[PDB]
Hints:
By secondary structure, chain A is mostly helical. Chain A has helices at 2-26, 31-48. Chain A contains two helices and no strands. The longest helix of chain A has 25 residues, at 2-26. Chain A is elongated, with a radius of gyration of 19 Å. Chain B has a domain at 11-110: Peroxidase, domain 1 (Orthogonal Bundle), CATH 1.10.520.20. Chain B has helices at residues 12-21, 28-42, 58-71, 77-88, 96-110, 125-137, 175-184, and strands at residues 112-113, 115-119, 146-147, 150-153, 161-165, 168-172. Chain B contains seven helices and six strands; from the N terminus they run H-H-H-H-H-E-E-H-E-E-E-E-H. In chain B, helix 3 packs antiparallel against helix 4. By secondary structure, chain B is an alpha/beta fold. In chain B, the strands form two sheets. In chain B, strands 4-2-5-6 form a four-stranded mixed β-sheet, with no helix packed on it. Chain C has helices at residues 133-138, 157-168, 185-197, 220-224, 226-239, 253-266, 279-287, 314-317, 331-336, 358-377, 379-384, 392-407, 416-419, 428-439, 457-468, and strands at 4-11, 14-19, 29-33, 40-47, 53-57, 70-76, 78-81, 89-90, 107-110, 146-147, 177-183, 211-215, 247-249, 300-301, 326-329, 342-348. Chain C folds into three domains: 1-76, Beta Barrel (Thrombin, subunit H); 77-351, P-loop containing nucleotide triphosphate hydrolases (Rossmann fold, 3-Layer(aba) Sandwich), CATH 3.40.50.300; 352-469, Bovine Mitochondrial F1-ATPase, ATP Synthase Beta Chain, Chain D, domain3 (Orthogonal Bundle), CATH 1.10.1140.10. In chain C, strand 1 and strand 2 (14-19) form a beta hairpin. Classes of the chains: A mainly alpha, B alpha/beta, C alpha/beta, E alpha/beta. The interface between D and E is large, with 72 and 73 residues. Chain D: Keywords: ATP synthesis, ATP-binding, CF(1), Hydrogen ion transport, Ion transport, Membrane, Mitochondrion, Mitochondrion inner membrane, Nucleotide-binding, Phosphoprotein, Transit peptide, Translocase, Transport. Chain D: One of its GO terms (biological process) is proton motive force-driven mitochondrial ATP synthesis. Chain G: This is ATP synthase subunit alpha, mitochondrial. Chain G: It is found in: Mitochondrion inner membrane.
Amino acid sequence: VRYEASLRQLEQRQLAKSVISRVQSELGNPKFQEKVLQQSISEIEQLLSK
Amino acid sequence: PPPVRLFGVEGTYATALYQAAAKNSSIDAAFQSLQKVESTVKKNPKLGHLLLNPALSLKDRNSVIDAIVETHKNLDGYVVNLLKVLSENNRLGCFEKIASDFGVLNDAHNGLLKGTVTSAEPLDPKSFKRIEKALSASKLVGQGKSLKLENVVKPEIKGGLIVELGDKTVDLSISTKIQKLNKVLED
Amino acid sequence: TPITGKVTAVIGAIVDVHFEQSELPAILNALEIKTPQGKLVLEVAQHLGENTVRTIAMDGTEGLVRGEKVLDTGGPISVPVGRETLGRIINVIGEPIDERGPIKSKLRKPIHADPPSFAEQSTSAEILETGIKVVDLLAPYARGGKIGLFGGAGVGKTVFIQELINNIAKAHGGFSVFTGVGERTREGNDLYREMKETGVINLEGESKVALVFGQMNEPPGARARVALTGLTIAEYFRDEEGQDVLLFIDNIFRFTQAGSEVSALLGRIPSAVGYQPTLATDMGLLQERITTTKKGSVTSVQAVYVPADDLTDPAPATTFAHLDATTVLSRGISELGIYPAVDPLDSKSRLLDAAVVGQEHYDVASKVQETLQTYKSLQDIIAILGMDELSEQDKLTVERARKIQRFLSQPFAVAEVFTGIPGKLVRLKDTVASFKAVLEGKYDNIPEHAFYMVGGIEDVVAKAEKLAA
Amino acid sequence: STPITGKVTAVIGAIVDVHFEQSELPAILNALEIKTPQGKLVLEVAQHLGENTVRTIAMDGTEGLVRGEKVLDTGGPISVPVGRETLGRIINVIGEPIDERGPIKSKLRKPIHADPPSFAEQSTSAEILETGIKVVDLLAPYARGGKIGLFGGAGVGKTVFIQELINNIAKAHGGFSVFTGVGERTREGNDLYREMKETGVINLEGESKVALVFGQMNEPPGARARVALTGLTIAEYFRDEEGQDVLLFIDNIFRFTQAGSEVSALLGRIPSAVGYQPTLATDMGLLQERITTTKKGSVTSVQAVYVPADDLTDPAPATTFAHLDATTVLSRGISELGIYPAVDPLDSKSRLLDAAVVGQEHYDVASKVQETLQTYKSLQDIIAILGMDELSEQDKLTVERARKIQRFLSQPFAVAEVFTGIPGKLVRLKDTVASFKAVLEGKYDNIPEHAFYMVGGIEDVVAKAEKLAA
Amino acid sequence: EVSSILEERIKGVSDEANLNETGRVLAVGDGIARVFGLNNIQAEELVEFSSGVKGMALNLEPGQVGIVLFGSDRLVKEGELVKRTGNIVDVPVGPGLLGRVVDALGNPIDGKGPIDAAGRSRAQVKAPGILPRRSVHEPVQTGLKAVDALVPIGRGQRELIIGDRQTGKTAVALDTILNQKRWNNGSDESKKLYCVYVAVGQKRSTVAQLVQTLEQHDAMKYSIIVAATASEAAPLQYLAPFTAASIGEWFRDNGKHALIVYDDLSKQAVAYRQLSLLLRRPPGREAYPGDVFYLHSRLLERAAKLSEKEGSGSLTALPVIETQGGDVSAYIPTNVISITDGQIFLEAELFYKGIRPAINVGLSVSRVGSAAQVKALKQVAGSLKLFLAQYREVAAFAQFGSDLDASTKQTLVRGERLTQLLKQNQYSPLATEEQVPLIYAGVNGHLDGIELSRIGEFESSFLSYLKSNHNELLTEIREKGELSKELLASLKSATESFVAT
Amino acid sequence: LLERAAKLSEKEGSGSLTALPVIETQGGDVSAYIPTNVISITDGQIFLEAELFYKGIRPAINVGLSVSRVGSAAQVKALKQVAGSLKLFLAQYREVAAFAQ
Amino acid sequence: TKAQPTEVSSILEERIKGVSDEANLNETGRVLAVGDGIARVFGLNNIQAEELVEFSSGVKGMALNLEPGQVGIVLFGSDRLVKEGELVKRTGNIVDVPVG
Lengths: 50, 187, 469, 470, 501, 101, 100
């Protein structure tokens, strides 16, 4: 019974590491270069809004 | 008078230096010259890295001072006397310190508002011109103050960028958002 | 580049590094200087700014070259745990000093843990038997309880814990913990051997006891993170497994003692007496990492070394709030010849009430507490005047109190050598009776000297015949 | 001089530092105002730190202060208002009404700081003030121009004792009063304010005969110290400019001591003995000398004092014990024994007790009383150990008179119609002298010990004897 | 889904606007930090660490501003930015913290139902004036006979429970909450009590039994528990009384009545010790800083009785001091004592003497006077105090085999029987209608005939006999809380009738 | 210092370093900081009374404060057999000679 | 590096301006900062220890600590009227009382 409930928590941690994993993937690709450009142009847009 | 009080210890000197140089309207001259006489200490690789921290008497250091102003005659009379004051109290390690502060004080007079626009990766030059334009348009720089943009590469900023100048900042990073997210994961 | 540094300072055994890049370090991480004497382990505990950490040292700092290189591991100090991790002794640097070879690593977990939540609590509500009369009657154990022990560690306080190990640990706890801060190294070998002799540790395989000792040779900062290391081994048993836990500690005063030692160097200003200004928070973290959960109950027996026998100092004092029960041991009862040396008027439990241990247990215990206390008040009058120069009612009470007091000694199996009287254990159930009988005058006929060094109630009677003949 | 603008640099708590413009500074003891959400913060300049930066004490909360917040200079000290419109207003540390009956309206205002009067003015007491309570009257009278000190422990009815005085002495003896509360509590504020409304001494139709300066302990330590100054400054205004006689009242003056110890540590002053201020000696001396009789009015202070943990050789009570002309001690024990007055009849010394000032009869009676109680206390050890029947005939008679004097020191109080329920009765100084003498002489040792309990003079005691008999 | 909840977290991170200030972290450790920068800061404001830690700011300096961390320091790192909220620290107050345990930030930590909030409140709320104040009103009982008679507390008043740790300290307080049952259930919301219990430096197992015990007696439908354990951060432990006070103030403000228990202030001083010494304030005596008094003094005065235009509101407070070593001539005890109206000193020895939870009646005082108790119950206990004082004096003489006399042994016997009657019991409070008979019985000397062992036997039986026949007397004592000439004569005849057994 | 002195095993050659740490007491002292710090490290005490030594009894040991807890073999058998349970006996004797009057 | 109590901003700008010391520090003193009745002077270079000094305010002092960067005068009187930048004359007579 203890273990059964522990397993419900465990699956959530197994998918928690997909998030951490997915970050390494995002930053491994030159989507790292292209979205950093996007962040510079959001700041411009934001800078007209203040 | 000083215009505003900036810096903690070893800023009492920097404060005092600006207000003495203020009465003539030649701080810009004083400071430039100080960069050029400080650099020639550095390009003295022995005894100008090996005599910044106390190691020899007040008097030998004072005589090191006398020798520095005899080889460079342009230093302005405020900065030739400031060195005397530093040598007599027997300090030279916080020599770059008064220099750095004195630059900030001077560039408040010039009306330059120095700024670092750190990014994850070096941005394009077009991205730069546009940030300089925009930042002027935004009310954080009212105008009257001339922004400078200094690019820095920090791979510790993991994605995004941060625009910093004066007491006004816009943090539009990815890195912070990741840190916040990682904490938030519960399900 | 990797977060390398140089040794700016070596002030005490609290080394300071200065990283040569502006890359971010972090706290509760570990750094290694590769030294020509083994390895040296450091732990970042403060960041002072200008790329300069200030570090706790887990190993000896003697013979240390400054401007000598450091490297950042990148993370916390990690022990090895397991279910077959048992039958070996563990130090704060991970290694064996018992030389039984590598421990079973399955999961390696940070010695620094975030304290579990208030929403998971499996509070003690089942009693435990200790098998000492004084203990059962006045302040009985429980399972999940947090017991405390006060006194020296040389006057019979240490002897007391041995009895407890002999009874409670050879028949409860499936995986059990011993954690010893500033633990006396040769004595540590004795504990290990006695554990082997009673066949509790069988090689480095399956065993129902594990042990952590960090010797009092080791410098104060290293000793401080022994405590933490031990608790991590306790938590694996707590979490993953549902199997019974125990903890025995000798002494967690020595954790507190170590904190006072480090305090000046780190950059803190010492508060009065000498004890750390960070005592409540630092104390708080270990004792909320000893707490009952619904993942398993955790019976704990803790020992506090009392310096100059002042219990009014904040390090012994602030513990009681974090306690359920105590059985305080003192020098005075030690002189009187009463072994165990437990104060009978200085014992308390949260299991003491008239429906937890029931009305009869309570009634008996109350009466015992009134009788001994009455005697304690009249110490002056008895010695200065007399007992016949004192009222007849109080004289009865006084006469009774010498018998009850004397009876409280229980010659132990680990003080059987010294006394010459074979070891005894008196049941919980027997105890209620034993004391109830004396209270009704059913045994106030036989010598005070027969109440000295006896086992149960029948032996008191029987020795009376031995001494009379 | 003219206003200045300084910008705040460090808020650490009560101490708040300001960094004023160069070549242009506010002086020591000036008043700076910073407009704040809840009143106007007044800052008292108490140190200069050099480089044209001051260090000041807040008198209003230090919640939400920006360091960089403009600080106007009024150009002077903290000045409250004084006047005959001070009467009935409830005044606070920064000097403004908090009862909203309107500001005190006078041509004259004064600073809270002042120098103690010069030697030439000074006058001594010589008259004997009448309190209207039997213990006070015989064994420790008051002296008009006194600095009486109401030292006492816990559970003595502190408020009760002082509340009795206001009922008796205050209406009878002309002149105004100022009642000043230093680190008072909100139970006590309401109960004091209510008691003086009953007696028609506070007139909300008239002007009052009392003025009030209530500063409570929920205000910063800084403020608690300098509330005392505000109330004293009003008494000075009464004594000097109007010429009036003052029966000044301060409550609890240990609170001044405690407050003063707090701002000491914070200001940089190193801790002195038993955790109290170093500047104990000098703050008290300055405070006390101001309280006196001059060549104008006559100021007779009655100051509550709290003796921490019933030890009065502790450095705050014991220093104050000297500065106060006419000490009393109230004690835990006597309250429990059932006797109210709670005053110890034995420890209570006035600055005037001699026979050519109190009168020859008054002196010879009180000389006997002191001896009778001191015998009984001495006899207690013999009674306690050996037995009580093994004492002599003279000792039993002395013990019986002593019990009688102990219970013929019970007076009821009007402000203890709560505490007890028996209503207070006023008895004269003269009457007390006479009443006490009859008892010593042995002419009233026919009266039961309990027929001396809470009654007037001799007339009531004889009658009350008959009453228990029935 | 586990995936569905993850999708939300990701959409709920990203984007944010201008920051009033920035500064980069440098000195930091022990959960105390100082950051460099930060110049639009004012006192008590909250600054958001980009760790995801929140810390309010308590030391302001023109160097490095000292921000007290509520988290850990293992996620703070040297170089990070911190961004000012622009909003001072606040706690949810509503009708939804009741029936829940909540930590000092005001979340449930037991994972009970949602916090309903009607408002937010501020940690410092200036304590009432003297204009909206009013006289003492509404007797509050604990259901402990000695406490009620002798040192009677009122609502809007403070009396300090002091004494050595774990001599029944917890049972005293638990008995008080338990007696509020009679009133919580009974009509009138300004007679009902919603108690707020504050726990500083206490271990979880103790709180978790305690709450269990309140649920058993159905007292955890109004109890609110504010907690800041020993492990959890030192600024949350300092901050814990002042935000509990605000959960109480709402009750006082609406006209409703409540009782706030502050257990213990002494560990609060140690959490504040740590905080004060690392933001470089110099200490006074025994390393407690000189502004300690200022902390307790502002706090306790926020419980005080209000007028009828504010709805007859009173928050009442009962501060608890557990003395870490014993001695009440210590620093912390002198400071709380001055602020409070009373002492309710408890004693170690009296624990062993068989009074449990144990109270000493002589080092306890109430300067609140006798009319903060039930009117009926004042009358009966009128000489209770006087008898007891008389006993204490005669007992002192009695020691050393001293020759006793007949006059004194009346007193001594009289006193002995009363104490045996009085003796408290663990975890059981009582109702005032049945406290009024027993004290009468003792005072008029119908208990001074009855043997010490049978004091208890009389106590049980005497109460029992009254339930059967004289249920009219109990009803009148409850209903009018004052005692009539007619009612006394009957009560007196009832006592005379039952004396044996 | 103290853990440098201690009996060792066969490997290290069976060697021992016997350590008696010797404390300068002002007529007996063991309720003060310095003694207590040594007691918790040591296996026991050899408490010897001031009054008795001085009045020419040597040795003069009070065995209410003299214990050792590893000492179960550390005597020649000869001096254990003859000295059978005398250590219990003189810890009855003080109590007997208190109330024998 | 270290912080002198003679690092005062008015004092420093004067040394920077190429102005030398010891013309207004002979006997001649100037208060730098006054707190708790403890005015601290920069000057008094011909003063005798324990010698009596007179401020511009109207206040008298004696000079128990002579330290090189400043002189810790102990004020006999008022703190109220004393402030930074006031002349402190050197009596030239050590603490003395009439005798006769």
